Protein backbone atom coordinates (compact mmCIF):
# COMPACT_ATOMS: atom_id res chain seq x y z
CA UNK A 1 0.00 0.00 0.00
CA UNK A 2 1.48 3.30 -1.16
CA UNK A 3 1.22 6.24 1.25
CA UNK A 4 -1.94 8.30 0.66
CA UNK A 5 -0.07 11.53 -0.01
CA UNK A 6 -2.97 13.37 -1.65
CA UNK A 7 -2.35 16.36 -3.89
CA UNK A 8 1.07 18.02 -3.84
CA UNK A 9 -0.55 21.41 -3.27
CA UNK A 10 -3.82 22.23 -1.57
CA UNK A 11 -6.34 22.91 -4.33
CA UNK A 12 -10.06 22.76 -4.88
CA UNK A 13 -10.90 19.07 -5.07
CA UNK A 14 -11.11 17.24 -8.38
CA UNK A 15 -14.04 14.96 -7.53
CA UNK A 16 -15.18 16.05 -4.03
CA UNK A 17 -17.34 18.77 -5.54
CA UNK A 18 -20.72 19.47 -7.06
CA UNK A 19 -20.33 18.71 -10.79
CA UNK A 20 -22.19 21.87 -11.85
CA UNK A 21 -19.60 24.22 -10.34
CA UNK A 22 -17.13 25.68 -12.83
CA UNK A 23 -13.55 25.30 -11.63
CA UNK A 24 -10.48 26.90 -13.18
CA UNK A 25 -7.55 25.03 -14.67
CA UNK A 26 -5.38 25.96 -11.68
CA UNK A 27 -8.20 24.76 -9.36
CA UNK A 28 -8.13 27.94 -7.26
CA UNK A 29 -11.09 29.83 -8.81
CA UNK A 30 -14.71 28.67 -8.94
CA UNK A 31 -17.94 30.02 -10.45
CA UNK A 32 -21.39 29.14 -9.15
CA UNK A 33 -24.23 27.72 -11.22
CA UNK A 34 -27.93 28.17 -10.29
CA UNK A 35 -28.88 26.98 -6.79
CA UNK A 36 -26.39 26.54 -3.98
CA UNK A 37 -23.75 23.87 -4.50
CA UNK A 38 -20.43 23.23 -2.82
CA UNK A 39 -16.79 22.24 -3.33
CA UNK A 40 -14.24 21.18 -0.70
CA UNK A 41 -10.48 21.58 -0.81
CA UNK A 42 -8.25 18.57 -1.44
CA UNK A 43 -6.84 18.51 2.12
CA UNK A 44 -8.49 18.94 5.51
CA UNK A 45 -7.31 19.42 9.07
CA UNK A 46 -7.97 17.50 12.28
CA UNK A 47 -5.87 19.34 14.89
CA UNK A 48 -4.19 22.72 15.33
CA UNK A 49 -4.81 26.25 14.12
CA UNK A 50 -5.21 26.79 10.38
CA UNK A 51 -5.97 29.65 7.98
CA UNK A 52 -6.96 30.36 4.39
CA UNK A 53 -8.32 33.27 2.36
CA UNK A 54 -11.04 33.73 -0.26
CA UNK A 55 -11.34 36.75 -2.56
CA UNK A 56 -14.77 37.58 -3.98
CA UNK A 57 -13.71 38.27 -7.57
CA UNK A 58 -17.19 39.00 -8.92
CA UNK A 59 -20.59 39.01 -7.22
CA UNK A 60 -23.29 40.31 -9.58
CA UNK A 61 -26.73 41.21 -8.23
CA UNK A 62 -28.77 38.21 -7.05
CA UNK A 63 -25.71 36.03 -6.41
CA UNK A 64 -24.36 34.90 -3.06
CA UNK A 65 -21.76 32.82 -1.26
CA UNK A 66 -21.62 30.80 1.93
CA UNK A 67 -17.98 30.14 2.79
CA UNK A 68 -16.21 28.29 5.57
CA UNK A 69 -15.38 24.75 6.70
CA UNK A 70 -16.90 21.33 5.99
CA UNK A 71 -16.38 17.77 7.16
CA UNK A 72 -16.38 15.08 4.44
CA UNK A 73 -20.09 14.29 4.86
CA UNK A 74 -21.29 17.85 4.21
CA UNK A 75 -23.93 17.86 1.48
CA UNK A 76 -22.42 19.03 -1.82
CA UNK A 77 -25.86 19.91 -3.27
CA UNK A 78 -26.81 22.27 -0.42
CA UNK A 79 -25.49 25.62 0.82
CA UNK A 80 -22.56 25.43 3.19
CA UNK A 81 -23.84 25.27 6.75
CA UNK A 82 -26.94 23.33 5.67
CA UNK A 83 -26.28 20.41 8.02
CA UNK A 84 -24.27 19.49 11.11
CA UNK A 85 -21.13 18.87 9.04
CA UNK A 86 -20.31 22.46 8.04
CA UNK A 87 -20.13 26.05 9.27
CA UNK A 88 -20.46 29.00 6.90
CA UNK A 89 -20.53 32.78 6.53
CA UNK A 90 -23.02 34.31 4.10
CA UNK A 91 -22.21 37.26 1.83
CA UNK A 92 -25.78 38.49 2.22
CA UNK A 93 -25.99 40.30 5.60
CA UNK A 94 -22.99 38.46 7.09
CA UNK A 95 -25.13 35.69 8.59
CA UNK A 96 -23.45 32.58 10.01
CA UNK A 97 -25.04 29.22 9.19
CA UNK A 98 -24.83 25.81 10.84
CA UNK A 99 -27.43 23.02 10.64
CA UNK A 100 -29.47 25.42 8.46
CA UNK A 101 -29.80 27.84 11.42
CA UNK A 102 -28.73 31.36 10.46
CA UNK A 103 -27.63 33.70 13.22
CA UNK A 104 -26.54 37.32 13.28
CA UNK A 105 -22.76 37.58 13.08
CA UNK A 106 -21.25 40.40 11.01
CA UNK A 107 -21.99 42.96 8.35
CA UNK A 108 -22.24 41.57 4.84
CA UNK A 109 -19.42 41.09 2.38
CA UNK A 110 -19.23 41.18 -1.39
CA UNK A 111 -17.24 41.87 -4.52
CA UNK A 112 -13.62 42.78 -3.88
CA UNK A 113 -13.60 41.69 -0.24
CA UNK A 114 -10.82 39.38 0.95
CA UNK A 115 -12.12 37.05 3.64
CA UNK A 116 -10.08 35.01 6.08
CA UNK A 117 -10.99 31.69 7.64
CA UNK A 118 -9.47 30.56 10.92
CA UNK A 119 -10.11 27.27 12.70
CA UNK A 120 -8.54 25.97 15.91
CA UNK A 121 -8.85 22.33 16.98
CA UNK A 122 -6.80 21.89 20.18
CA UNK A 123 -5.15 18.55 20.86
CA UNK A 124 -6.77 18.31 24.31
CA UNK A 125 -10.53 18.51 23.79
CA UNK A 126 -11.24 18.54 27.55
CA UNK A 127 -8.79 20.99 29.15
CA UNK A 128 -7.56 22.67 25.98
CA UNK A 129 -8.33 26.25 25.00
CA UNK A 130 -11.52 25.18 23.22
CA UNK A 131 -12.21 24.75 19.51
CA UNK A 132 -13.13 27.85 17.51
CA UNK A 133 -14.08 29.11 14.07
CA UNK A 134 -13.28 32.77 13.36
CA UNK A 135 -13.94 34.80 10.20
CA UNK A 136 -11.98 37.84 9.01
CA UNK A 137 -13.00 40.61 6.61
CA UNK A 138 -10.14 42.49 4.91
CA UNK A 139 -7.90 41.63 7.84
CA UNK A 140 -10.37 42.48 10.63
CA UNK A 141 -11.36 39.77 13.10
CA UNK A 142 -15.16 39.53 12.98
CA UNK A 143 -15.40 37.57 16.24
CA UNK A 144 -15.67 33.94 17.28
CA UNK A 145 -18.44 32.59 15.05
CA UNK A 146 -18.58 29.06 16.50
CA UNK A 147 -17.05 27.32 19.49
CA UNK A 148 -16.96 23.72 20.74
CA UNK A 149 -17.47 22.40 17.23
CA UNK A 150 -17.99 18.78 16.25
CA UNK A 151 -14.71 16.87 16.29
CA UNK A 152 -13.60 15.65 12.88
CA UNK A 153 -11.63 16.60 9.79
CA UNK A 154 -12.50 20.02 8.38
CA UNK A 155 -11.95 21.02 4.76
CA UNK A 156 -11.93 24.57 3.41
CA UNK A 157 -15.26 24.82 1.64
CA UNK A 158 -17.07 27.08 -0.82
CA UNK A 159 -20.75 27.13 -1.73
CA UNK A 160 -22.00 29.57 -4.35
CA UNK A 161 -25.48 30.69 -5.39
CA UNK A 162 -25.70 31.54 -9.11
CA UNK A 163 -22.85 32.89 -11.22
CA UNK A 164 -20.58 34.63 -8.75
CA UNK A 165 -16.81 34.09 -8.83
CA UNK A 166 -14.40 33.56 -5.93
CA UNK A 167 -10.74 32.59 -5.65
CA UNK A 168 -9.26 30.64 -2.75
CA UNK A 169 -5.72 31.19 -1.42
CA UNK A 170 -4.45 28.45 0.89
CA UNK A 171 -1.13 30.18 1.53
CA UNK A 172 1.63 30.40 2.33
CA UNK A 173 1.36 34.14 1.49
CA UNK A 174 -1.85 35.89 2.54
CA UNK A 175 -3.07 39.38 1.67
CA UNK A 176 -4.21 40.10 5.25
CA UNK A 177 -2.36 37.71 7.59
CA UNK A 178 -4.01 37.92 11.02
CA UNK A 179 -2.11 39.95 13.59
CA UNK A 180 -3.89 38.59 16.69
CA UNK A 181 -3.55 34.79 16.35
CA UNK A 182 -1.01 32.17 15.35
CA UNK A 183 -1.80 29.58 12.70
CA UNK A 184 -0.38 27.41 9.97
CA UNK A 185 -1.37 28.10 6.36
CA UNK A 186 -3.67 25.47 4.88
CA UNK A 187 -0.98 25.05 2.20
CA UNK A 188 1.16 23.22 4.78
CA UNK A 189 -1.15 20.22 4.25
CA UNK A 190 0.09 19.65 0.69
CA UNK A 191 2.86 17.07 0.58
CA UNK A 192 4.90 19.50 -1.50
CA UNK A 193 5.07 21.76 1.55
CA UNK A 194 6.36 18.84 3.63
CA UNK A 195 9.11 18.36 1.04
CA UNK A 196 9.95 22.08 1.19
CA UNK A 197 10.08 22.00 5.00
CA UNK A 198 12.29 18.90 5.01
CA UNK A 199 14.81 20.55 2.68
CA UNK A 200 14.60 23.88 4.52
CA UNK A 201 15.48 22.11 7.78
CA UNK A 202 18.33 20.24 6.10
CA UNK A 203 19.71 23.49 4.66
CA UNK A 204 19.65 25.09 8.12
CA UNK A 205 21.56 22.06 9.44
CA UNK A 206 24.11 22.31 6.61
CA UNK A 207 24.63 25.98 7.46
CA UNK A 208 25.43 24.97 11.05
CA UNK A 209 27.87 22.30 9.86
CA UNK A 210 29.72 24.65 7.50
CA UNK A 211 29.56 28.15 9.03
CA UNK A 212 28.71 27.52 12.66
CA UNK A 213 26.32 30.01 14.22
CA UNK A 214 26.79 33.08 16.38
Contact set with another protein (CB under 8 A) = 1-3, 5, 8, 191-192, 194-199, 202-207, 209-211
Closer to another protein by CB, 1 or 173: give it.
1
Q: Least Å distance between CB 3 and another protein?
A: 5
| Closer Cβ to another protein, 5 or 73, answer by number | 5
| DSSP annotation of 208 | H
Kindly state the smallest distance separating residue 54's Cβ from another protein, in Å: 27
> In angstroms, rounded to a whole number, what is the distance separating the alpha carbons of residues 18 and 10?
18
Nearer to another protein, 83 or 196 (CB): 196
- Residues 6 or more apart whose Cβ sits within 8 Å of residue 161: 32, 35, 36, 63, 64, 65, 66, 79
Residue pair 169/52 in contact by the 8 Å Cβ criterion: yes
Tell the smallest beta-carbon distance from residue 123 to another protein (Å): 19
Cβ nearer to another protein, comparing 73 with 199: 199
* Cβ–Cβ < 8 Å for 115, 56: yes
Q: Minimum Å distance from CB 14 to another protein?
A: 16
List, in order, residues 6 or more apart from 214 with CB less than 8 Å away.
Answer: none
Name the minimum Å distance from CB 172 to another protein.
14
| CA gyration radius, the chain | 18
Name which of 148 and 211 has its Cβ closer to another protein.
Answer: 211
Amino acid sequence: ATYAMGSMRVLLALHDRAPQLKISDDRLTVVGEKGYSMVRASHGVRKGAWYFEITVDEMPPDTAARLGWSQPLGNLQAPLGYDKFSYSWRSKKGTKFHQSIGKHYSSGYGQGDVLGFYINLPEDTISGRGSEIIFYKNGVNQGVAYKDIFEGVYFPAISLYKSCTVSINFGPCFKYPPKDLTYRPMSDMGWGAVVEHTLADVLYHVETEVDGRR
